[PDB]
Every structure is written in C-alpha cells, then in structure tokens.
Amino acid sequence: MNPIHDRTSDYHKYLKVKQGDSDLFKLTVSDKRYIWYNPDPKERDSYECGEIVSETSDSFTFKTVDGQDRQVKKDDANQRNPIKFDGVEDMSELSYLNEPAVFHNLRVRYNQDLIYTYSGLFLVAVNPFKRIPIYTQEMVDIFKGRRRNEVAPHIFAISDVAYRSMLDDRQNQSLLITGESGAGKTENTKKVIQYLASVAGRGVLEQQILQANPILEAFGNAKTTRNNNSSEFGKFIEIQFNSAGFISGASIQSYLLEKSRVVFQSETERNYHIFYQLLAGATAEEKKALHLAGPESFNYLNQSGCVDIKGVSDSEEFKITRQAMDIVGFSQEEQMSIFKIIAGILHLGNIKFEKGAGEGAVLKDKTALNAASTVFGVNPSVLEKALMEPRILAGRDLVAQHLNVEKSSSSRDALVKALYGRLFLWLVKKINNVLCQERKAYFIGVLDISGFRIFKVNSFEQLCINYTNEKLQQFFNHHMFKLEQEEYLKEKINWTFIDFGLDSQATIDLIDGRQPPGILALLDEQSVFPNATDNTLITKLHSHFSKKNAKYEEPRFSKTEFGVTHYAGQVMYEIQDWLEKNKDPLQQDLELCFKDSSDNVVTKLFNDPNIASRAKKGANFITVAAQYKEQLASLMATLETTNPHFVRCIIPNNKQLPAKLEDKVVLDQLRCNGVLEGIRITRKGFPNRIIYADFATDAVEQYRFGITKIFFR
Numbered sequence: 143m144n145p146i147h148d149r150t151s152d153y154h155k156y157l158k159v160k161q162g163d164s165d166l167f168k169l170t171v172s173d174k175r176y177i178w179y180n181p182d183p184k185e186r187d188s189y190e191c192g193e194i195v196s197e198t199s200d201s202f203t204f205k206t207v208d209g210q211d212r213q214v215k216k217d218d219a220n221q222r223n224p225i226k227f228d229g230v231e232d233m234s235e236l237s238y239l240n241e242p243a244v245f246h247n248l249r250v251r252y253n254q255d256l257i258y259t260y261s262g263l264f265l266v267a268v269n270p271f272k273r274i275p276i277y278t279q280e281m282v283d284i285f286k287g288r289r290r291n292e293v294a295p296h297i298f299a300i301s302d303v304a305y306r307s308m309l310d311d312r313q314n315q316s317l318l319i320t321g322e323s324g325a326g327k328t329e330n331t332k333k334v335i336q337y338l339a340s341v342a343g344r345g346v347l348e349q350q351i352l353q354a355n356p357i358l359e360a361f362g363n364a365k366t367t368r369n370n371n372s373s374e375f376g377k378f379i380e381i382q383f384n385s386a387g388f389i390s391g392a393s394i395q396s397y398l399l400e401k402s403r404v405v406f407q408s409e410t411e412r413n414y415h416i417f418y419q420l421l422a423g424a425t426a427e428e429k430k431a432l433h434l435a436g437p438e439s440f441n442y443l444n445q446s447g448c449v450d451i452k453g454v455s456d457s458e459e460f461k462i463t464r465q466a467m468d469i470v471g472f473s474q475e476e477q478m479s480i481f482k483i484i485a486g487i488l489h490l491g492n493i494k495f496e497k498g499a500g501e502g503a504v505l506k507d508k509t510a511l512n513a514a515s516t517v518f519g520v521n522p523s524v525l526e527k528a529l530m531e532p533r534i535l536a537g538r539d540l541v542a543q544h545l546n547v548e549k550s551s552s553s554r555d556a557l558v559k560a561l562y563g564r565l566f567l568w569l570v571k572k573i574n575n576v577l578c579q580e581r582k583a584y585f586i587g588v589l590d591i592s593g594f595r596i597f598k599v600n601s602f603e604q605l606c607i608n609y610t611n612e613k614l615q616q617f618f619n620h621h622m623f624k625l626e627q628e629e630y631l632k633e634k635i636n637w638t639f640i641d642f643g644l645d646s647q648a649t650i651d652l653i654d655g656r657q658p659p660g661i662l663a664l665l666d667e668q669s670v671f672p673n674a675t676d677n678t679l680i681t682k683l684h685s686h687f688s689k690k691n692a693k694y695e696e697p698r699f700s701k702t703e704f705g706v707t708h709y710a711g712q713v714m715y716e717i718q719d720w721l722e723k724n725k726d727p728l729q730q731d732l733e734l735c736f737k738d739s740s741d742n743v744v745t746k747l748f749n750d751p752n753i754a755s756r757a758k759k760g761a762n763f764i765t766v767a768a769q770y771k772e773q774l775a776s777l778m779a780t781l782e783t784t785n786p787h788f789v790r791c792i793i794p795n796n797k798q799l800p801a802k803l804e805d806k807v808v809l810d811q812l813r814c815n816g817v818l819e820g821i822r823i824t825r826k827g828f829p830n831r832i833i834y835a836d837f838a839t840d841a842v843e844q845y846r847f848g849i850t851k852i853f854f855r
C-alpha cells in the first residue's frame with residue numbers, strides 16, 4: 143500500500159495534518175467571519191481573534207475576547223481565513239494574506255510538529271528544537287521523483303525539485319538555506335546532502351561526501367549562547383553530477399572562519415569542539431606525546447566557565463571525527479599532525495609573558511614554550527626570539543624589536559589564529575582533493591552562510607556577515623521580484639509594476655562601493671595610511687556618510703561607532719581594532735620559524751602559497767576586506783549561473799526550547815525574509831510560462847497571451 147495514502151504510515155503520522163473531529167467539522171461549516179486584531183495597539187505582534195458582527199461600505203465591527211465592540215476600516219482589516227485553510231501546505235492558497243494569518247497557519251502546523259510549509263515558490267522551516275522521525279531512508283524513498291504538489295512540504299521535496307529541474311532544463315541549481323543563528327540552516331543543509339547522495343548515488347564517493355561536514359564541524363563549530371552547535375564559518379557545497387544525473391563529485395568553499403574564538407570566548411560559550419574532543423578522546427599514549435591535560439589546564443579553554451555541552455559526549459564525538467577522517471582518506475600520520483597543531487595551539491596559549499629589566503618582555507617559565515615547539519617540530523629558542531624579539535626592516539636596515547608583554551601576547555595570539563585558519567583551509571583543500579576528482583557536467587550548490595546578526599557588540603566580523611546576508615537578500619529580491627516583473631513587461635502581458643518595497647542596493651553600495659568610496663574602500667585607504675588610528679578611521683567614516691547617506695547614522699551616544707540600516711534592521715558597529723583586523727599581521731620571523739618545522743602538515747601551512755601567501759597588491763598586501771569582497775563577488779557570480787531555491791529557516795524563540803512558538807520572534811523573521819511579498823508575487827503574477835511551440839494558438843482570465851509565450855496563474 144502507498145504510504146502517501148496509507149493513514150497508518152509514518153509519512154501520514156509525521157508529515158500530514160491530523161484528521162479533524164466532528165466538533166471541528168461543525169466549526170468548519172459555520173458561515174461566521176473573524177478578524178485578527180491587536181488587543182493592545184502598543185503590541186503589534188500580539189493578536190486575538192474577534193468575530194465580525196456588522197459592516198458598513200468601508201468598515202467592519204467586531205466583538206473582542208473581552209466582549210467590547212471595535213471598528214476597523216476594511217483597508218486596515220486583517221481578516222482571518224476560513225478555518226478549512228488552517229494547516230494548508232502552501233500559504234499562497236490562503237484567501238487572506240496578512241501577517242497574523244501567515245503566523246497562525248505556521249502555528250497550527252508547528253503545534254502538530256509540521257515544521258515545513260511552502261510560501262509560494264520557497265520553503266519555510268521552523269526549528270522544532272527536538273527530533274522528528276522524518277529523515278529516514280524510508281522517507282527519502284517516498285520523496286524520490288515526486289512532484290512538489292504530490293507530497294507534503296519537506297526539505298527532501300525542494301531537493302528533488304532542484305534535482306529534476308537540473309535534468310529537465312540542463313541547468314545548474316542552488317539551494318540557499320538562510321536564517322539567524324540557531325534557526326536550523328546546518329541541519330537542513332545536511333538533509334539536502336543526505337537526500338541527493340541517496341537519489342543520485344551509484345557508493346564510496348557518496349559515503350566520503352557524507353563524511354565531509356562531520357570533519358568541518360569538529361573544527362568550525364562551537365557552543366555559543368544562541369546555538370550549542372553554532373557554525374563559525376559559512377559554506378558553499380557544490381554537489382557535482384554527470385550528464386546522466388549521477389553524483390560525480392563535490393566541492394566545498396568556506397567563508398569567514400571566526401578565528402578570534404580560538405583565543406577568547408564569552409562566559410558560558412566554548413572554543414571549537416575539536417579542542418574538547420581531543421582532550422576527552424585521546425589515548426593515554428597520545429596524551430603523553432602531545433603533553434595533554436584537562437581543559438581547565440589551558441588558558442584557551444578555562445576562561446568561559448564551560449567545558450561541556452549537555453547531551454554531548456566529546457570523546458564519542460572524537461571517535462566520529464576520527465572515523466570521518468579515515469573514510470575521507472586522511473592518513474594516520476596526517477591525523478596525528480592535525481592533533482599536534484591543536485595541542486600546540488593550547489600550549490601556545492599557556493605562554494605567560496612577563497616584564498623584564500625595563501621595557502621589553504621576558505619568558506621566565508619555558509614549559510609551555512617547549513611543549514608547543516615539540517608538537518610543532520620547531521626550534522624553541524628560534525620560537526622565543528620570533529615572539530618577543532622579531533626582526534623588521536627600518537628602510538633597508540635589519541632591526542631587532544623588543545616587544546613588551548602586551549605586544550608579545552598579541553603576536554602569540556596572531557600566530558595561534560594564523561595556525562588555526564591555515565589548518566582549516568588545509569582541511570577544506572584535503573577534503574576537495576578527494577571529492578572533486580572529475581569534471582562536473584552540472585551542479586547543485588547548497589549555501590549555508592552565517593546568519594544575519596545584531597549582537598550587543600558588532601565589529602568587523604559582524605559587518606562581513608551582515609554584508610554577505612545583504613547581498614543574498616538582494617539576490618532573493620532580484621530573482622523573486624525584479625526579474626519576474628521584467629519577464630512580464632518584455633512579453634507585453636499588460637502588467638502593472640508592483641513596488642514590493644524591498645531594495646538592498648543603497649546599503650550594499652554604502653558598504654562595498656567604489657564611487658563614491660564605501661566603508662570597505664575607506665577602511666582599506668586608512669589601512670595603508672601610516673598615521674591611521676581608530677580615531678582617524680571613525681572621523682573619515684563620519685566625514686563621508688554622516689547626514690549624507692540615509693542608510694548611515696553617526697550616533698550621539700558614542701564617538702567610536704556608526705550605524706548601518708540593513709534589510710533586517712539597524713546595526714551599530716564599533717571600529718576598535720579594525721585597522722589591525724584588516725591588515726591581519728603576522729611577524730615574518732614567526733613565518734620563518736614555522737617554515738622550518740619537522741612536521742609535514744605544519745610545513746604545508748607555511749610553504750603552500752595558496753594557504754600561506756597573501757595576494758600581491760603593490761606597495762602592501764591585499765587587505766582582509768578586499769580579499770573578502772572578491773571571494774563574495776565570485777560566490778554571487780556562481781549563484782547567478784544557477785536556478786535558485788530558497789529555504790527560510792525560522793527560529794521559534796530565543797531560548798532553544800521546543801513547543802514554544804513566539805509571536806514577536808517569528809513575526810520579526812517573516813518581515814525580514816520577505817515571506818508575505820514572496821507569496822504576493824506568486825498570487826498576483828503568472829508563475830508558469832509555456833510557449834505554443836513547447837506543448838487557434840489559444841485552442842480553448844487566469845491566463846495572458848504574450849509576444850512569445852502563454853502565461854498562467
């Protein structure tokens with residue numbers, strides 16, 4: 143029996159709306175009309191349901207839950223959909239398209255653990271914050287080759303749609319999985335990968351593809367206050383296919399790894415999972431060879447007050463990371479070198495610099511220095527001198543510096559951050575060498591980049607993330623609205639342009655523009671100006687955009703911050719240390735020291751130009767901002783060669799709790815993601831177009847005859 147029609151199947155139980163009872167039936171056939179209203183107009187996102195009792199030509203009168211009658215203009219009314227629409231799988235079918243109506247549909251579904259809902263062309267996924275048995279091989283098999291309209295909403299169905307369009311249209315595809323921290327991006331990304339591996343698999347290559355994310359998560363994920371498994375890097379995964387539709391390989395591109403987490407963590411947060419995994423999972427032999435101890439013995443792990451995650455066994459995770467490495471193809475020697483680098487970083491963090499005779503730092507206790515030098519295979523006396531007494535050129539003269547405690551400690555942190563970043567780049571390169579071994583015919587790209595963020599402190603790293611999200615929103619806007627209307631106006635179907643009110647260009651230009659120069663261009667200019675400070679930088683920004691740019695704000699409450707109005711709201715950025723972050727400096731004597739390592743992996747991190755080198759940009763190296771703008775432009779160009787599909791992950795609350803869908807939290811995300819605007823284009827427009835020579839020309843309202851095609855709703 144077909145599980146799609148079997149009321150006893152797990153498909154029906156977990157993916158379909160439960161059969162309503164005779165009491166619900168009686169309510170459903172009622173001719174009564176209702177309105178969604180705010181009992182307190184100071185709380186716009188808090189709604190109640192009121193019955194319409196009377197009407198005039200331009201108004202409705204309704205009874206409140208309290209009993210009192212209120213009047214609302216028909217133009218201002220948010221009518222409640224007939225209850226037969228409650229739980230509808232595609233919200234473009236709703237009679238009334240409004241904020242409480244959309245929220246209420248999502249709520250009815252969520253109360254039944256139905257996390258997936260369509261909003262016209264795209265998928266909405268509300269995080270359940272609990273396990274739902276809808277990702278089995280049995281579920282995969284049900285979704286295989288079914289049309290979107292034939293099955294319930296699911297991450298598997300949007301993945302199958304992308305796969306079929308790739309075969310039928312001979313076009314590359316993309317699945318853009320977006321949302322704020324902890325919304326569910328990474329979980330849904332993994333479901334896309336699992337699905338494609340199964341429906342397009344032949345498998346050794348498929349198993350290795352499935353083992354790529356567990357390796358990268360051990361090194362790129364950490365417990366933050368918003369997510370126990372927060373991704374601290376963005377990723378673009380290309381699943382590669384041959385002409386026949388079989389997976390021929392995969393490619394991974396990583397973005398914005400949060401390197402400062404290695405040296406500093408906020409209270410309750412953790413460093414990268416790998417540090418805890420190695421300390422809990424190492425064999426007694428490994429612990430002796432790498433000079434390991436408990437996380438409380440390392441400065442890089444004993445500052446937050448948190449060394450474990452509830453329900454996570456770090457030693458068991460370590461076995462999973464090690465098995466993922468074995469499957470992918472990392473040798474035991476390469477794995478041991480990877481663990482020596484992690485061990486070495488922890489030892490480097492324990493180096494305590496002290497003031498010596500007069501100005502200049504000394505190292506009184508060499509235990510941590512020697513432990514780091516042993517695992518790294520470097521000379522400890524050369525390491526010591528490179529940290530406290532690095533040599534530089536003053537003109538053409540060779541001068542030994544003598545760094546004080548603060549500068550010595552900052553140089554040591556720069557080395558740690560360089561080691562970790564370079565190791566992460568190396569892991570991605572090693573994974574790609576295995577998974578990308580054929581020339582692809584087509585691809586399905588899965589994008590999982592860091593979500594839009596408004597933290598208490600927003601710095602350069604938050605600007606790069608929010609800028610990326612701003613580019614993605616514009617891409618969504620262009621594909622959903624602009625390009626769609628441009629097709630209607632070119633085909634001459636007598637279309638009246640709709641201003642959807644979404645425009646990210648001014649914010650994008652404010653950040654990455656060249657003429658007039660944007661934030662990044664001004665930061666790069668200041669980064670090469672010898673006398674630049676945090677003060678000259680903020681003054682330069684204020685001079686260029688204050689009272690000149692509608693998206694920019696010079697705050698009255700601070701002298702070191704500026705505001706940017708993003709699609710997802712205003713963000714105040716602090717500029718402290720942006721010059722140093724943009725230069726990302728590392729003392730050349732440290733590079734020389736590590737280039738001379740006895741370790742084969744450490745050597746690659748300092749000698750492979752594609753990992754170690756910084757692009758040549760004349761007088762000075764390329765800045766981090768210029769490098770990132772370029773890497774992002776390249777991502778956008780790849781995305782523009784694809785047919786895109788959007789998955790909007792919605793966090794239900796800010797407490798990481800299941801069964802607690804919060805009005806204010808969800809409605810704020812729906813407004814940012816353009817969910818209502820997205821449903822309006824699907825309803826008001828002509829989503830499907832087929833030519834007469836693609837099936838007198840009419841051969842027969844809800845259609846439009848165009849110049850070269852017939853449009854239908």
Ligand SMILES: Nc1ncnc2c1ncn2[C@@H]1O[C@H](COP(=O)(O)OP(=O)(O)O)[C@@H](O)[C@H]1O
Nearest residue numbers: 269271272273323324325326327328329369371
């Ligand atoms: N579909 C889902 N099913 C079960 N748990 C989920 C699901 N999506 C998210 N979660 C839970 O929420 C957490 C955060 O999800 P995640 O994908 O890591 O978010 P993001 O990448 O958006 O920051 C997960 O670790 C898991 O506990």
Ligand SMILES: [Mg+2]
Nearest residue numbers: 327328372373
């Ligand atoms: Mg994630």
